[PDB]
């Protein structure tokens, strides 16, 4: 239960393996360790594979089945849909740049516009946390000049979720694909 400062990304991954050795998750401890890792671009450059047209998901570690650790690359103006997290824990740590996170309530089954509950600006090295009980979110790089890179951890791993239409609240099931795995482009 002894949380030390990750010296490197590899060190963080080792610590993560220990934290997720069990059946449950100490959210605050995982968030603290993610936040404590000081982004060193040389260590994660391998995974930082950008696409011109949308943000990419780049698998770093499969956490021995307990979590997916991945690097997301957000080009200028790239954003996500409004989405849930399939009953998983979801951690987002900024490695480079800034991201806007917008929170939404779960829609009522009446077709109505989804109005923002709140929004915040995630800054370099900060780690955000979300789960379905907290709400739905959209994450966007609103910068015109700076690409953003985040380190994301989802537990349990999931490869499907729901996208929500902001104007009705209607949801559609989406399958997530990885742009790369372990540094390898996977079309
Ligand atoms: Fe998300």
Swiss-Prot record:
Induction: By increase of sulfur amino acid intake.
Catalytic activity: L-cysteine + O2 = 3-sulfino-L-alanine + H(+)
A GO cellular component annotation in the UniProt record: cytosol
Obligatory cofactor(s): Fe cation; Ni(2+); Zn(2+)
Enzyme class, UniProt record, top EC level: oxidoreductase
GO MF term list: cysteine dioxygenase activity; ferrous iron binding; nickel cation binding; zinc ion binding
Cross-link position per record: 3'-(S-cysteinyl)-tyrosine (Cys-Tyr): 90-154
Positions bound to Fe cation: 83, 85, 137
Protein's recorded name: Cysteine dioxygenase type 1
Organism ancestry: Eukaryota, Metazoa, Chordata, Craniata, Vertebrata
Protein encoded by which gene: Cdo1
